[PDB]
Structure formats: structure tokens, C-alpha cells
Amino acid sequence: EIFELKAELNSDKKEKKKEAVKKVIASMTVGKDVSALFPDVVNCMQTDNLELKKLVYLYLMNYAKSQPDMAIMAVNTFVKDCEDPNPLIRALAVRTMGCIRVDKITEYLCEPLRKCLKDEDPYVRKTAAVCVAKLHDINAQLVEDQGFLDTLKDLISDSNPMVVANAVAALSEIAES
Amino acid sequence: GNIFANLFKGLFGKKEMRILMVGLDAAGKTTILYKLKLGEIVTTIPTIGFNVETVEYKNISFTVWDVGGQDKIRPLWRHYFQNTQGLIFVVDSNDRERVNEAREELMRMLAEDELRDAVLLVFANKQDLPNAMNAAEITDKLGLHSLRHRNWYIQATCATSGDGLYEGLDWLSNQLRNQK
Amino acid sequence: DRKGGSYSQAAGSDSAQS
Amino acid sequence: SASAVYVLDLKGKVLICRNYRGDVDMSEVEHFMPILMEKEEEGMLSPILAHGGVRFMWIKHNNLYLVATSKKNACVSLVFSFLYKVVQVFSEYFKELEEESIRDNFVIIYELLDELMDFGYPQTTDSKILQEYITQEAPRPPATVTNAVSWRSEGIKYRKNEVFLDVIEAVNLLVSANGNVLRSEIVGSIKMRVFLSGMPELRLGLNDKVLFDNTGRGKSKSVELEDVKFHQCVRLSRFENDRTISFIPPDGEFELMSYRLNTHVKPLIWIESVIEKHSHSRIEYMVKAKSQFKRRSTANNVEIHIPVPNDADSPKFKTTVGSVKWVPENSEIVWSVKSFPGGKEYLMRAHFGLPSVEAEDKEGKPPISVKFEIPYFTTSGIQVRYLKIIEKSGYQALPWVRYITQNGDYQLRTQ
Ligand SMILES: Nc1nc2c(ncn2[C@@H]2O[C@H](COP(=O)(O)OP(=O)(O)OP(=O)(O)O)[C@@H](O)[C@H]2O)c(=O)[nH]1
Ligand SMILES: [Mg+2]
């Protein structure tokens, strides 16, 4: 069971890696403690297929507070994925970075957040605005040090009405606390 | 059973092989991997995690798994030791103070009973400054000849130039593949 | 045919209001 | 400001959960079921629960409760709107809303949940727009989400340009037991299935009373819609300026406007029912249905529900037009009529037995509700005047619309 799943996930075949990822996702939804296999799924994270990357990101987000020590092996992957040409991949990486409740991980995520704050893609801009609010809620001092308030304020006075609304909501949430 | 399909696949090339990228930080490992894969000196931030890439040469897929030399990532090299067939050690001849640390890390990584079939692959990185040693002084200092049951080979590769990478790849292919 | 009343074509605008 | 949107089941098991802020522990869902059970057994059950410092506000679905936990003073209306949008998205993607698709569409369900809301703030809710970036069978997100027009995907091309409208009427009557009608309101529903090429800007024009008064023609038959709720595509500023209904129709079927005005006319169907229920001996149902609607309109599929006794057995129906059947599951007599011409009068004489032993507890008097549906009959008298379909390329549209009159909350209080 667990050994077979680990062997399938540690293979060189994408057809077996996708099946292992799907089984791990189903086990977590079915109510199975799959946090023990978090380090094994870390190796099979940087994949070209977008179908398995989303599952890996969801597993990391749901298995981040449980194993914060094992989550240190994903900062480089997040940094690499934060510069992908596809807006969807960048938005997913930004959402996953802010969704991880790791004290030692949000500190190194300030640079990707700053880079994606001025992203031309409206989806990327909205993802960065959401991640800034998430980081401020997680760590207000880190957000203040990163100077994201000035970037958030300029978001309302720019184009992309959806992105402007998202930035306004993030600013209201930050000011609420 | 029948092995006709295997013979047909091997008639045009079937073996791929593997490789590892370990060493101290700022040792040219990322630059060496970029040169092997692309062929340009790409400047990158320090490897907080790891980099995984593949190189296609001589009909063998030489997959390279770059590993950083950070203190928090030094003990993480055991994660890639599972299902690993090759290992490449990147030395830092431009760091006299870090040479001892790199040698100690190589000895610690080579003192595991799980990593026994991985032949030694010493790459002389940063081979562009006059302070860099030769291909024998570094090996003598590291004691590569004292590694019993270890097939190590010291090769000097210049990160800026790229010379010696072909020789290292050929040596790795000869050590991995034992056919015509 | 169709239950609930047959569909009828609609105009383009108030032609009597200019 | 939802903290974690989760989907429950009928047995208390969480089919799927997706935390958005992480400020609420995932173990609080276990106490939601006991809290709901306690609230239901004491009459204090509400859609919004409260587990200490965390509130569990969710609605009841077909088979699972979409409970969304929250901790701060989050907007309850916003949470309800997000839940409704999620339910609509699930219905559009999955034809059935039950446990059969929750455990079978997890791969796409998780992606849809992640893309719909981030950090508790929803960003994308259009099913048509969301279907171009998240599919169960990924390219860059469409420019429609980033662009202002998020309800009409650009580049749509069709062989023909046909738009089908549906002016569905809802005749709701609240008739008290004294014979008078208390709540008699008619809510319009203009649902159109736009199927055109490009991104046309529809200019809806009707015989509104306000528009007729402004233009100076406030003397003909004009619909006096007390409340008009336009869709997202309809420009609020244009309607507020000079009653100009200009909007880009979406690709598919959607609700453009939803009129709602009171009705001061006589009911289309008048039910005169009597209850000659003997004391544990028998019961009589002298129910007579009078059609006050126009004779040119026929109320197809007329079903006047007459609530009979719950313990009544061996019932006999003596009617004139239409089949009368008693369903023990509903505990009422369904006066089903296939065709009900306007001005017709159907008389029925029910007769059912009753056990000698009296019931232990009272059962109440449910109101009698009719299911009349007369097509091609507009009670409010509102008629579509024009539909300005304008396209940059230039094409000849073929708009269509049909008027359907049905019964909404048309219940009659019993004696
Ligand atoms: N100019 C120059 N620098 C070199 C050369 N060889 C190695 N370096 C240094 O080595 C570093 C190589 O770092 P990377 O290519 O990003 O990857 P790395 O070797 O694993 O270093 P880390 O990422 O810190 O672990 C560069 O920053 C250079 O400063 C060389 O031939 N010329
Ligand atoms: Mg590197």
C-alpha cells in the first residue's frame, strides 16, 4: 500500500506518477493521513504536466503545517515556477506560496511576491494581490518590511478592474486587522 | 519469453543512464549543468532546493540532478541517493578554506552503504583563475586514490569556456556503458 | 411546436419613437 | 470571509474540503453534525451555525450541505453568494448534484475550488468562462476574465444568429381561508438563450410604464414593474439614465431581467372547496375550480392540489373534468387536468373514510396550491417592443421570444 505508492511515485514513468498522485489526493479526501509521504512526493513535484503540478501544490498546502521541516525543499521549486511564461502556472505558484503556513517559507517568498506584484497579466496581478494579503495576515511585520502597502495602493489606480477590486479587497483586509 | 523488442530497441540505442550533481555552493555546479544542457553561462541565484535536468548525448539520456551546497541542504543529499546510479562531485579549487569542507562532505556522502554502485566523478570547476590547482594536486589533497571500490576520475572543466565537458561526458559514458 | 406558447419573433427597436 | 469551504454529506462525512485562509482547524467540521442535530431537535436549527468562536454558515444542497466555516466577522451575504455560485458552477459542470459526482470528479473539483476563490475572496464565478481554463477531459486563462466583459467570450461564431427568449410568468396568490387574497404578486422572468456570432450588444426594449411616460405615450397598455433586477451584462447606468436596457448577451441560456410587480386583478383560477368532514365517520370535498382567465388561453397541465386527511383511506372522487388521484406519499388529492380552457368550471366531490380511533396529534391544514400553466398568456400585459442586436461585423439577427404563464406561490388557505 504505502510502500507500493512510494515506489510508484519514485519511478521515471509519468503514467505511474500521475496515478500515484491521484491516489494520494483521493486518500486525503477519503480521510487518510498521507502526511508521512510528503517527502516522497517532493521529488515528483517539478513536472511539465499541469495536471500533476496542481495536485502536488494542493498536497503541499494541506501538508505544510503538519511537516513544516519537510516544506523547506519547495522554495526553489516555487521560485522557478514563479517565472513561467504561462500566466496560469505563475498564478498557481503565487496562490500556493501564500497558502503555505510556514514561518521559514514566507520570508523567502517576498521576492516572488514583489516580482509578481507588477506583473502585466491581470490574473498574475490578482494572484500577487491575494498573496500579499495572505502574507500580511500570516506576518504583518514581513509585509510591512517588504513595502507591499505602496504596491497595493497603486493597484487601485491602475487598469484591470478585476485586479483593482482584488487589490482593494486585500487592502481592506490588511487595514481590518 | 521473447526479447525481440528489446533487441530492436537496442539496435538503435536504448540505454539512458543517470547522473548526480552534488558539491559545495558556488562551485559551478549550476553553471556546469546549464552548459551541459544548453551551452551558455547562465547566472542563477543560489540553489536553495535542487535542480533536475537531463542531457542527451551519445544516445544516452544523462539526467543531472543539481544539489546545492547550503548548510541546510547538505544533509538533504540522501534524498537523491535512492534510485541513483551515478554521482558527480564538483570541487571548489578557488576556495582554500572551503576545500576541507567539500572534502569532508564528499567523504561523508561516500561513506554510505546505500550508494555503492555510483562511480566517482570529480569535476574541477572554476578552472579559469591562476589559483586553481591541477588535476592531480586536488585529487591528492582529497585522497581520491584511497577510495576502495570507487571508480573516480578527475576532470578539469572551465565554467566560462566549457572545455573538458566532452571528455567528462565520454568518461562517464565509458564507466556506465560497457559495450561497443 | 412547443409547450408553453409558440416562440414569436421580436422587433429591433421602437420604430414609432424614432 | 469564509475560512474553509467544505462539502458535507447526509451521514456527516465531508465529501471534499478546501481551506482558504487556514484560520479554522479542519477538525471543527466534526462538531458541525452534532450541532446541527441538536439545533434541529430543539427548533433552533439555522443555516449559520456557531461552534464556539467559529461560525459554520452553509446552505442545504440536494444531498450534501456546503458548510463554509468562518471565524472573523465575515459577510454572511457574501458567503451565501459564494455558496450559490459554487452550486451553480457544479450544476453547470455536473448534471447531477449528489455524492456520485463528488467522489468521481475530485480531480476537476479541487481545481475548480482552488480557482474559484483565493484567501476567501472569490474572483471567477462564470461557468462558461471557467470552462475554458478548467476541464475534466491547461492553456492560458482567457482574456474575458481579465477584460471588463467577463460574461461573453469573444470569438464565438455560429452558422446562424438566433436568440430565443422566454417570458415566463409566475402567478403567486396568497388566498386566506376567509376567501380573500392577501399576497397576490406576479414576478416576471425574461430568460433568453442567446446564440449569435461575435459579441453583440443587445438593446432590450419593452413597453415599460416608465419608458412610455418618459417618451410621452403613457396611455396604452404598459407593464408597471415595481422592481426590475437586470443581469450582470445589463448596464445599470444605462437603465438608471433613461431606462435604456443595453447589455451584451452571454453565450447560452441566462436570466437577463427579473421583473416583480404586484397584481390587483382577479386570480386566473378560482377554487371553491368545502370540507364536510364527519367526526371520525367520513369526509366530503366539494371542490369547484373556476377559470377566470381569458377563454382564448388554455391552462395546460392544471394540477390543483387538495390536501386530504393524512389517515384517510378508501377514498372516492366524483369529478367532472380531469383525472383525480390521491397520493398517500403527499397526503393530498391531486386534481390533475390536462387541458383547462379559459372560463371552464370543474366540479369535484371527494369522499373518503376515516378510522374510528382519533389521531394522537394534530396534523395541520396545509394550503391548497394549484399548478396551472397557461402558455401564450401574459397576465401582466408586458410585451417586448424591440431588441437592438448590433454587431461590429454586421449581421441580420433572428431574435425570438415566447410568453409562458404559470402559477408560482398560488396557494389557497384552508378552513
Ligand atoms: N566568472 C566565473 N564564475 C564561476 C566560474 N566557475 C564557477 N563560478 C562561480 O560559481 C557560481 C556558480 O553558481 P550556479 O551556477 O548558480 O550553481 P552552483 O555552482 O551550484 O552554486 P549554488 O547555486 O550557490 O549552489 C557562480 O556564481 C560563479 O561565481 C567561472 O568559470 N567563471
Ligand atoms: Mg546550482
Distance CA D120, CA D73 (A): 13
Kindly tell me the sign of the dihedral angle through the C-alpha atoms of D190, D193, D196, D198. positive
D251 close to D241: Cβ distance less than 8 angstroms: no
CA distance D75 to chain C (A): 40
Contact A73 B47 (CB under 8 A): no
Distance CA D156, CA D150 (A): 14
Q: Does C18 touch chain D (CB under 8 A)?
A: no
Q: What is the distance, to the nearest Å, from the Cα of residue A170 to the centroid of all Cα atoms in its chain?
A: 17
- Reading phi first (left if > 0) and then psi (alpha if -120 to 50, else beta), residue D179 is in left
DSSP string, B23-70: E-TTSSHHHHHHHHHTSS-------SSEEEEEEEETTEEEEEEEE---
Experimental technique behind these coordinates: cryo-EM
Amino acid, res. D139? P
The grid cell for D264 is: 390587483
Distance CA D113, CA D16 (A): 10
Cβ contacts of residue A13 below 8 Å, gap of 6+? none
CA B44 to ligand 1 centroid distance, Å: 8
What is the SS3 assignment for chain D?
Answer: CCCEEEECCCCCCCCEEEECCCCCCHHHHHHHHHHHHHHHHHCCCCCECCECCEEEEEEECCCCEEEEEECCCCCHHHHHHHHHHHHHHHHHHCCCCCHHHHCCCHHHHHHHHHHHEECCEECCCCHHHHCCCCCCCCCCCCHHHHCCCCCCCCCCCCCCCEEEEEEEEEEEEEECCCCCEEEEEEECEEEEEEECCCCCEEEEEECEHHHHHHHCCCCCCCECCCEEEECCCECHHHHHHHCCEEECCCCEEEEEEEEEEECCCCCCEEEECCECCCCCCEEEEEEEEEECCCCCCECCCEEEEECCCCCCEEEEEEECCCEEEEECCCCEEEEEECCCECCCEEEEEEEEECCCCCCCCCCCCCCEEECCEEECCCCCCCCEEEEEEECCCCCCCEEEEEEEEEECCCEECCC
B45-55 in b/e form (b: 16+ CB < 10 A) is eebbbbbbbeb
Cα end-to-end distance, chain A, whole Å: 46
Q: Which of D257, D260, D258 is nearest to D226 (CA)?
A: D260
Choose from A8, A14, A43, A80 for mutation: most chain B CBs within 10 A. Answer: A43
Report the residue from C6, C11, C13 with minimal CB separation from D376.
C6
CB–CB contacts below 8 A, C to D:
61
Q: What are phi and psi of D256, to 5 degrees?
A: -80, -60
Which residues of chain C make contact with D302, given a CB cutoff of 8 A?
Answer: none
DSSP string, B141-164: HHTGGG-TT----EEE--TTT-TT
Beta bridge partners of B56: B61
Cβ contacts of residue A105 below 8 Å, gap of 6+? A64, A68, A71, A72, A74, A75, A97
Task: State the residue for C-alpha cell 519469453.
Answer: B1
From the candidates B70, B82, B155, B175, give the one annotated as an active-site residue: B70
The grid cell for A74 is: 519547495
Kindly tell me the sign of the dihedral angle through the C-alpha atoms of D132, D134, D135, D140. positive
Q: Which of B112, B103, B22, B35 is nearest to B70 (CA)?
A: B22
Tell whether ligand 1 has an atom less than 6 A from the beta carbon of residue B126. yes
| Ligand with an atom nearest the CA of residue B44 | 1
Cβ contacts of residue D53 below 8 Å, gap of 6+? D71
The answer on whether B1 is annotated among ligand-binding residues is: no
CA distance D138 to chain A (A): 6
The grid cell for D96 is: 447531477
Cβ contacts of residue D305 below 8 Å, gap of 6+? D330, D332, D333, D334, D335, D368, D369, D370, D371
D102 close to D15: Cβ distance less than 8 angstroms: yes
Report the residue from D164, D215, D217 with minimal CB separation from C7.
D164
Distance CA D115, CA D124 (A): 7
- The burial of D275, by beta-carbon neighbours within 10 Å (0-12 exposed, 13-18 middle, 19 or more buried), is given as middle
The answer on whether B157 is annotated among ligand-binding residues is: no
**CATH architecture of the region D269-375:** Sandwich (2.60)
Q: Which of D258, D154, D232 is nearest to D197 (CA)?
A: D154
- The burial of D103, by beta-carbon neighbours within 10 Å (0-12 exposed, 13-18 middle, 19 or more buried), is given as middle
Judged by 3 or more CB pairs under 8 A, whether B touches A is yes
Angle, in degrees to the nearest 10, between helices B165-176 and B29-37: 80
Alpha helices in chain A (DSSP H): 2-9, 14-30, 38-43, 50-62, 75-81, 87-99, 110-117, 122-138, 140-146, 148-156, 161-176
Q: Give the three-class secondary structure for A132.
A: helix
Sheet holding D332-337, edge to edge: D302-306, D332-337, D323-327
Distance CA D200, CA D154 (A): 10
Tell whether ligand 1 has an atom less than 6 A from the beta carbon of residue B46. yes
CA B49 to ligand 2 centroid distance, Å: 9
Cα end-to-end distance, chain B, whole Å: 26
Distance CA D125, CA D316 (A): 53
Which residues of chain C make contact with D401, given a CB cutoff of 8 A?
Answer: 7-10
Which class does domain D4-131 fall in? alpha beta
Which residues of chain A make contact with D118, given a CB cutoff of 8 A?
Answer: 95, 126-127, 130
Distance CA D47, CA D261 (A): 29
| Local structure of residue B114 (DSSP, 8 states) | S
A18 close to A51: Cβ distance less than 8 angstroms: yes
Distance CA B42, CA B33 (A): 10
Q: Which of D374, D292, D287 is nearest to D332 (CA)?
A: D287
CA B32 to ligand 2 centroid distance, Å: 9
Tell whether ligand 1 has an atom less than 6 A from the beta carbon of residue B161. no
Report the residue from A29, A137, A162 with minimal CB separation from D123.
A162
Length of chain D: 415
The grid cell for D281 is: 365517520
Length of chain A: 177
The grid cell for A100 is: 503555505
Tell whether ligand 1 has an atom less than 6 A from the beta carbon of residue B30. yes
Determine whether B179 is an active site residue. no
Distance CA B154, CA B157 (A): 10
The answer on whether B139 is annotated among ligand-binding residues is: no
Say what the resolution is, in angstroms.
Answer: 20.0
Distance CA A6, CA A9 (A): 5
Cβ contacts of residue D133 below 8 Å, gap of 6+? A88, D115, D139, D141, D142, D145
B167 close to B57: Cβ distance less than 8 angstroms: no
Q: What are phi and psi of D33, to 5 degrees?
A: -60, -50
Distance CA D320, CA B1 (A): 83
Which residues of chain A make contact with B49, given a CB cutoff of 8 A?
Answer: 73-77
Residue of chain B whose alpha carbon sits nearest to that of A46? B52
Q: Give the three-class secondary structure for B82.
A: coil
Distance CA D4, CA D56 (A): 10
Largest CA distance in chain A: 54
Sheet holding D16-19, edge to edge: D16-19, D4-7, D65-70, D55-60
Which atom from ligand 1 is nearest to the alpha carbon of B24? 25
CA B32 to ligand 1 centroid distance, Å: 8
Beta bridge partners of B50: B67
Distance CA B140, CA B147 (A): 12
CA distance D167 to chain C (A): 10
The grid cell for A148 is: 507591499
CA B68 to ligand 2 centroid distance, Å: 6
Task: Tell how strand B122-125 and strand D55-60 pair up.
Answer: unpaired
Kindly tell me the sign of the dihedral angle through the C-alpha atoms of D40, D44, D50, D51. negative
Q: Which of B48, B24, B32, B152 is nearest to B100 (CA)?
A: B24
Q: Give the three-class secondary structure for B91.
A: strand
The answer on whether B29 is annotated among ligand-binding residues is: yes
- Name which residue sits closest to atom 12 of ligand 1, judged by CA: B28
Task: State the residue for C-alpha cell 494542493.
Answer: A58
